[PDB]
Amino acid sequence: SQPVFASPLNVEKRRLNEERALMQAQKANIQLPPNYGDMDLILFPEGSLKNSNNTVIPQSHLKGKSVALYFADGADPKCASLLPFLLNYYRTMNEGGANQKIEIIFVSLDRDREAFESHRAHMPWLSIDLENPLTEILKRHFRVMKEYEVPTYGYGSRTGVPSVIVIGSDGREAQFLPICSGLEEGDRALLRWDWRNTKFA
């Protein structure tokens, strides 16, 4: 149910969890359908994340690390402005300390594979392959797009590209960093990252 209702992640987790609830009821005082908190989800599949060496890491590798989705475009001038700053933010937190603090997943809105690769080669945190449907699903889940070819379900866009949104384990919106939104902190919305209380569990 978080942050929205009409998203492929939410309908898919709802289907799996209440099918599991029906199976438990058949093999059984259980209420149908299950509560949203009782619903459990794998937010990322087995082979969806790759690091700078293009080696697949599982979703469970992200425990204890404040992870955020970065919806980005290769050719967008705001994205190209924001990217060196995000590099410096990644360095300035992940070097200064004994424990790793922040991870950034990369979701591409780029037009094609080779320009996706050219944008992704400059970027050392994790990324999702463009042709994988998980990127499209995450776009619909967090309501990020530049123009409405994607049919929204009576909703609107939460924000436009670029977008750094801190995400949870089951897919809730932890907090939105307002890069280009109604609050409009370019270059300094990254300092609103509350990495203490946003943890991937």
């Binding site: 001038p77 190209a80 060196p84 590099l87 370019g186």
Partner: peptide, 27 residues
């Protein structure tokens, strides 16, 4: 065309001396 290529913090932190934003990212 106004777009910024090449990744460096120091090449944009003090670009307001000669360039302004244009709400399209165009310097």
């Amino acid at each position: 065309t106004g777009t910024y290529c090449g990744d460096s913090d120091l090449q944009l932190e003090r670009i307001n001396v000669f360039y302004n934003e244009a709400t399209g990212g165009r310097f």
